[model samples]
Each structure stands twice: as structure tokens, then as C-alpha cells.
Target: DTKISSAAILGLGIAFAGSKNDEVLGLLLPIAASTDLPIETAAMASLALAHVFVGTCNGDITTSIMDNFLERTAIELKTDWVRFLALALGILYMGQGEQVDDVLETISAIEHPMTSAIEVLVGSCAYTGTG
Candidate 1:
């Protein structure tokens, strides 16, 4: 049986075959253990999955996951990009506008992330179904 223990990862397709994280990891663990993608990725993803609740709140938490994701994938993902995208995504899901400034501060602190951060914030909101 496929080891997919969570719903979100299932949505990613191919990776988990619509399986939950626990199930997927059950499968992924063996595969990863056999490979060299760095054991830390599994640990990080596990932590992120465990803290899905916090991800729904802080704009940075999801970015934390995204950042770890890039590392696990061996893809040259820019940290700034992940930070920008995660902040916007987290805020939108939160549905609270008061935290915008805090999100901005986080983005601004990262050099080279501000432009994309603003664009993500503005554009996502502009075209987002909520807006």
C-alpha cells in the first residue's frame, strides 16, 4: 500500500499518489534512505507536516516548508522567492488583513526578495478569488 498519510502532499501528484504524508513517507522513507537526497529533507518535511497548524497562521511557516522542499528536491530554488510566495500564500489562507505589515517586514528584511514579495502580495490579491 502507498504510504500517503496527509491530504496536501497527495495533491502534489506523482510524489505521493494522492496518499497521506504518513503513508507517503512510509514509502518515501525507504526510497530516501536508499538514496542521497539528504536525510534532513524527510525530517524537515515531517516537521512541516506536523506543524501544519502554524503554517496556517504565520506567513513564514509555509516558507519554511517551501525552503526545505527546494533543498530536498536538489533544485536551485531561490530562498527569496520561496519567502515571497509563502508569505503571500500564508496570508491569503489566514484571511486576516491586519498582518500585512508584519508580512511586509519579513519580506523586506530579505535582500532581493522585496520586489517579488510586493508583486506576489498585490497580484495574488488582485486576481485571487477572495478579492
Candidate 2:
């Protein structure tokens, strides 16, 4: 039941990637941060948010996602979830080099498992096709 729910949510996120649909965002942001939900649902929701908000560098949404990253860091949640959250932000800020500096700085404080791959996600895309 929950898995199906997560699947549908993820499908919606992917479907709406870059649409910047405020209605979908209104639906998903709360789910992304819902303590009442399973990590599967929350992370799926976060990833969904990522797809919806991707490449926008929206300060408000970035803060929300980053807040989740901080919250998850405190609890020391699953690495997969951590990665998912990072990937969510990574994609959201995709292809926006200097702007990503703030993200790198913010996430740098997280001294848990390394996220060099996250660097690649944010970095490669952030600098995609640059000189």
C-alpha cells in the first residue's frame, strides 16, 4: 500500500519535472517533510519535489529541502535516504554553477558519510557544457 503510494508520488514527480506547478508543489512539500510518513514516502516526496522544482534554484524550496537534509542528518538516517535527499537538491540546482556554491557550503557541515558523488551530481551538472 505504502509502496504503491510512493510509486505514484514518484511518477507524478517525474511527470512534473520542471513544470514548476505550484499546485503539485503544494501537495508534495508537506509530504517531503512529514514525520508521520515512512522514509520511503518522505524521500520519494523529496525526490518528487526535486523533479518538480529542478533547475529553478528556488530559495524557498531549497531551504525546505536543505532543512530536511539537516533534520535527517541529526537522526543519522539511512545513507540511501541521505543520498536521495542530496540528489534531490543536486538536480534542483542543476547546471547553475556559482549558485551551487551555497549548497556545497551548506551541506559541507554534514560530516557523516562522504558525498563526493553528490559533488559529481551537483558539479557536473552545475558546470555542464561550460568552458
Candidate 3:
């Protein structure tokens, strides 16, 4: 809260960036559903940010998820696949000022709800393991 205004401005930036990729938005929904991830995760992901997270773990998660999705989907992504993946992640998880406001509602159509989404994107849920 030290820089609430600045943070809000940064959130706007994230929303803008998240607007680009549909797949990225799809992937990110579940992570956003859970409130458990440390707030720093958002900061690390550079959500609503101007430019940040050098050597940060947040981007690593995003990258790994993208890598896995590409390998698994085997759909032959374009050179800009990274952008698609990043946007999908942001669409679901960026929370406040998110570019895709209805992603949660959209994902809700699934039988397992956001939990399955989380599992698919992040590998597993914290609650599932009592961690």
C-alpha cells in the first residue's frame, strides 16, 4: 500500500498487455481464482506493471506453463506464441484491472470449476496437497 496509486496505474498497464493473447488469458484464470498465492506472485508476473521482475519467479511460472502448453498442444504456434501464452495467463489471473473481466465466469462452465484450471496450468493445487 506504500504506493497505491502507482500500483493501480501499473494494474492498468497489465490489463493493456493482457488484452493481446486469448490462450494466455485462458491459462491464467485459475491462478487468479485462488487467493493463496503470495501477493508478490502478481508483482513478479509484472501484472499491471510498467516494467519489472528481473530474474523473478513469476515470469518463470508463466514461461514454464507456456512451454508445457506448447509441447502438449503440438499445435505449431506462430513465432508470437509467447505473446499468446502470456495473454492467456493474464486474462485469468491478473485480478483487479484485469483486461478480460469475464474469464472467471467463462471458465466456470467447466465441471470442475477453476480448481481444474489451476491444476492444468500450475500442475496442482495447494489445497489438494495440504501444503
Candidate 4:
């Protein structure tokens, strides 16, 4: 039942994709930072924030998630769910080419089983529909 709510929360992002709605973004940040919640939901929140900010290249948002969600717990709280944050990074910088380069490098530094896949997703997402 709770996971269902998390799925619903994910839909919030899909519905609001690229909306750039501040309140919703703020709402999602807290969820992304939470470690107590189910890991999937926490990761879902990270993606939700990305969905809202897609292509915005917002540094404040990225830093927040990086510090609060991604870097907050390291691998203990970060797992495959981390790719969620990695994808979030891509969407935030989507279509803004070059800006994503360092991030892709940074993501690759991680040695997760999904590491390369994460790089590819981030790379493609940032470069898609490019100028």
C-alpha cells in the first residue's frame, strides 16, 4: 500500500514534468533527503524533483539533492537507488550540453553495477533533442 503511494508520487513528477513548480520541488527535496522512508520512495522523490526541473540546469536543485540525497549517506543509504540521483542529474541538465560532462564523469567515478548504464542514461538524456 505504501509503495503504491510512492508510485503515485512518481506520477506527480510525470504530470508535472518541466513544470518548474517551486512548491512541488521543495516538497520533493525533503522526501529525497529522507532515509527512513522506503528506499524506493526516497529514490522516487529524487526523480520527481528531476522531472519537475527537466532541462532547467538548476544548480541549487542539483546541489541540494547531491548533498541531501546523494552524498548525504554515501553508499549506506545509496545503492542502486543512487542511479535515481544520477538520472536526476541528467534531467536537470538536459539539453544544456557540456554542463553534463563533468556530472557524467562524476557519476562514472562511482563503481556501482549500474555505473555504466547510469552514465549512458545521463549522457543520452542530457544530449537528447540537442541543439
lDDT of each: 0.44, 0.62, 0.40, 0.61
Which ten-residue region of model 1 has the weakest summed lDDT? Answer: 50-59
Runs of candidate 2 with Cα error greater than 4 angstroms are 1-4, 7-19, 54-57, 73-77, 109-131
Candidate 4 has an lDDT of: 0.61
Q: Candidate 2 vs candidate 4: which has greater lDDT?
A: 2
> Using Cα atoms with residue i matched to residue i, what is each candidate's TM-score against the true structure?
0.33, 0.61, 0.21, 0.54
Segments in model 3 whose C-alpha atoms lie over 4 Å from true places: 1-11, 14-50, 58-67, 70-74, 82-131
The segments of candidate 1 whose C-alpha lies over 4 angstroms from its true place after superposition are 1-88, 91-93, 113-119, 122-131
* Best TM-score among the predictions, by candidate number: 2
lDDT per residue for candidate 4 within 1-131, as digits (tens), equals 55777677667656776547677667666666674655565766666565555545567676656655444444454466665566566556655667677766775676655457666766676554645
For model 1, how does the per-residue alpha-carbon lDDT over 32-77 read when each residue is reduced to its tens digit?
Answer: 3324564444443434343333333433334444354334443334
Cα lDDT tens digits, model 2, 60-99, are 6666566665556345545567666666666665546577
Question: TM-score for model 4?
Answer: 0.54
In model 2, pairs of residues that clash are: none
> Cα RMSDs of all predictions?
9.5, 4.4, 15.1, 5.4
Candidate 3, residues 11-100: lDDT per residue as tens digits?
656564543445544445344222355323433343432232221224434444434442333232333443444454654344322222
| Candidate with maximal lDDT | 2
Clashing pairs in 4: none
